[PDB]
Design an enzyme around this catalytic site. Structure first.
Site, PDB file in Angstrom:
ATOM      1  N   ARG A  54       0.858  -1.182   0.000  1.00  0.00           N
ATOM      2  CA  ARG A  54       0.000   0.000   0.000  1.00  0.00           C
ATOM      3  C   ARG A  54       0.894   1.233   0.000  1.00  0.00           C
ATOM      4  O   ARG A  54       1.559   1.513   1.000  1.00  0.00           O
ATOM      5  CB  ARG A  54      -0.936   0.000   1.215  1.00  0.00           C
ATOM      6  CG  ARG A  54      -1.974   1.103   1.196  1.00  0.00           C
ATOM      7  CD  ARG A  54      -2.856   1.055   2.439  1.00  0.00           C
ATOM      8  NE  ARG A  54      -4.022   1.927   2.282  1.00  0.00           N
ATOM      9  CZ  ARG A  54      -4.331   2.932   3.089  1.00  0.00           C
ATOM     10  NH1 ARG A  54      -3.579   3.194   4.150  1.00  0.00           N
ATOM     11  NH2 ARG A  54      -5.415   3.658   2.842  1.00  0.00           N
ATOM     12  N   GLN A  62       3.391   1.591   3.067  1.00  0.00           N
ATOM     13  CA  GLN A  62       3.088   0.589   4.083  1.00  0.00           C
ATOM     14  C   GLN A  62       3.507  -0.808   3.636  1.00  0.00           C
ATOM     15  O   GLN A  62       3.267  -1.204   2.493  1.00  0.00           O
ATOM     16  CB  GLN A  62       1.587   0.582   4.417  1.00  0.00           C
ATOM     17  CG  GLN A  62       1.203  -0.432   5.477  1.00  0.00           C
ATOM     18  CD  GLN A  62      -0.186  -0.184   6.038  1.00  0.00           C
ATOM     19  OE1 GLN A  62      -0.706   0.926   5.944  1.00  0.00           O
ATOM     20  NE2 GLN A  62      -0.794  -1.218   6.624  1.00  0.00           N
ATOM     21  N   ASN A 101      -1.852  -0.424  12.360  1.00  0.00           N
ATOM     22  CA  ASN A 101      -2.667  -1.189  13.293  1.00  0.00           C
ATOM     23  C   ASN A 101      -4.119  -1.143  12.851  1.00  0.00           C
ATOM     24  O   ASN A 101      -4.493  -0.410  11.931  1.00  0.00           O
ATOM     25  CB  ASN A 101      -2.495  -0.685  14.736  1.00  0.00           C
ATOM     26  CG  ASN A 101      -3.054   0.720  14.957  1.00  0.00           C
ATOM     27  OD1 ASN A 101      -4.195   1.021  14.604  1.00  0.00           O
ATOM     28  ND2 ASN A 101      -2.250   1.581  15.578  1.00  0.00           N
ATOM     29  N   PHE A 112       4.579   1.572   8.532  1.00  0.00           N
ATOM     30  CA  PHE A 112       4.596   2.488   7.402  1.00  0.00           C
ATOM     31  C   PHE A 112       5.721   3.500   7.550  1.00  0.00           C
ATOM     32  O   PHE A 112       6.162   3.815   8.658  1.00  0.00           O
ATOM     33  CB  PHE A 112       3.225   3.189   7.204  1.00  0.00           C
ATOM     34  CG  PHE A 112       2.736   3.984   8.396  1.00  0.00           C
ATOM     35  CD1 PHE A 112       2.154   3.352   9.484  1.00  0.00           C
ATOM     36  CD2 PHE A 112       2.814   5.366   8.393  1.00  0.00           C
ATOM     37  CE1 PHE A 112       1.675   4.097  10.577  1.00  0.00           C
ATOM     38  CE2 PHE A 112       2.339   6.120   9.478  1.00  0.00           C
ATOM     39  CZ  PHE A 112       1.768   5.473  10.569  1.00  0.00           C
ATOM     40  N   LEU A 121      -1.998  11.213  13.241  1.00  0.00           N
ATOM     41  CA  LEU A 121      -1.757   9.870  13.739  1.00  0.00           C
ATOM     42  C   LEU A 121      -1.091   9.870  15.109  1.00  0.00           C
ATOM     43  O   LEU A 121      -0.966   8.804  15.720  1.00  0.00           O
ATOM     44  CB  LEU A 121      -0.914   9.079  12.727  1.00  0.00           C
ATOM     45  CG  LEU A 121      -1.585   8.944  11.349  1.00  0.00           C
ATOM     46  CD1 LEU A 121      -0.662   8.214  10.371  1.00  0.00           C
ATOM     47  CD2 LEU A 121      -2.917   8.227  11.450  1.00  0.00           C
ATOM     48  N   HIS A 125      -0.822   5.754  16.466  1.00  0.00           N
ATOM     49  CA  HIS A 125       0.156   4.823  15.936  1.00  0.00           C
ATOM     50  C   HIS A 125       1.473   5.040  16.657  1.00  0.00           C
ATOM     51  O   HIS A 125       1.861   6.185  16.923  1.00  0.00           O
ATOM     52  CB  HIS A 125       0.311   5.015  14.433  1.00  0.00           C
ATOM     53  CG  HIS A 125      -0.938   4.688  13.681  1.00  0.00           C
ATOM     54  ND1 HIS A 125      -1.139   3.462  13.094  1.00  0.00           N
ATOM     55  CD2 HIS A 125      -2.080   5.394  13.492  1.00  0.00           C
ATOM     56  CE1 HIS A 125      -2.345   3.431  12.549  1.00  0.00           C
ATOM     57  NE2 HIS A 125      -2.934   4.593  12.769  1.00  0.00           N
TER      58      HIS A 125
END
Length: 164
Positions: A54, A62, A101, A112, A121, A125
């Site tokens: 991704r 990612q 996650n 990532f 984030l 994260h």
């Protein structure tokens, strides 16, 4: 005394270059050790051969799903998932290495690399490292992504391990 790990990246099997990371074991030792061990493969499983499944230009790359290869799998060295260790470190800009996650306390192996500041984030994260060398290689990887994250060529970790 923070460890350093490397990824050798390939594009449809053709070597692209090396990305190295400092892992912030001094602040998130449990999260750093997971990524370090998965990079050496010393537990018998890990990142070698897996892909960046991704990639969203202007956001992040990612990877780390070595069991289902599409963002639905992965596992940590501690079991399938482990807790959010802490949120001391923030998503301050490009090069930040952070855990992917699926909700609170569901860290596995996916991670990532930020290609922009992703401050929203913070506290969601766990940040545990940063690109040291080869941000230019990450930027080259970014060009094979798309809005929805699907890649136009296969971006693989052809080799990985620990340096120093």
């Amino acid at each position: 005394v923070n460890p350093t790990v490397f990824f050798d990246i390939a594009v449809d099997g053709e070597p692209l270059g090396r990305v190295s990371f400092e892992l912030f074991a001094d602040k998130v030792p449990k999260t750093a050790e997971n990524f370090r061990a998965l990079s050496t493969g010393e537990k018998g499983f890990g990142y070698k051969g897996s892909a960046f499944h991704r990639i969203i230009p202007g956001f992040m790359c990612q990877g780390g799903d070595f069991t289902r290869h599409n963002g639905t799998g992965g596992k940590s060295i501690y079991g399938e998932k482990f807790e959010d260790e802490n949120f001391i470190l923030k998503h301050t800009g490009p090069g930040i290495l952070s855990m992917a996650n699926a909700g609170p306390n569901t860290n596995g192996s996916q991670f990532f690399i930020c290609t922009a500041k992703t401050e929203w984030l913070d506290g969601c994260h766990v940040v545990f490292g940063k690109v040291k060398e080869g941000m230019n290689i990450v930027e080259a990887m970014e060009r094979f992504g798309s809005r929805n994250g699907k890649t136009s060529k296969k971006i693989t970790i052809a080799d990985c391990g620990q340096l120093e």
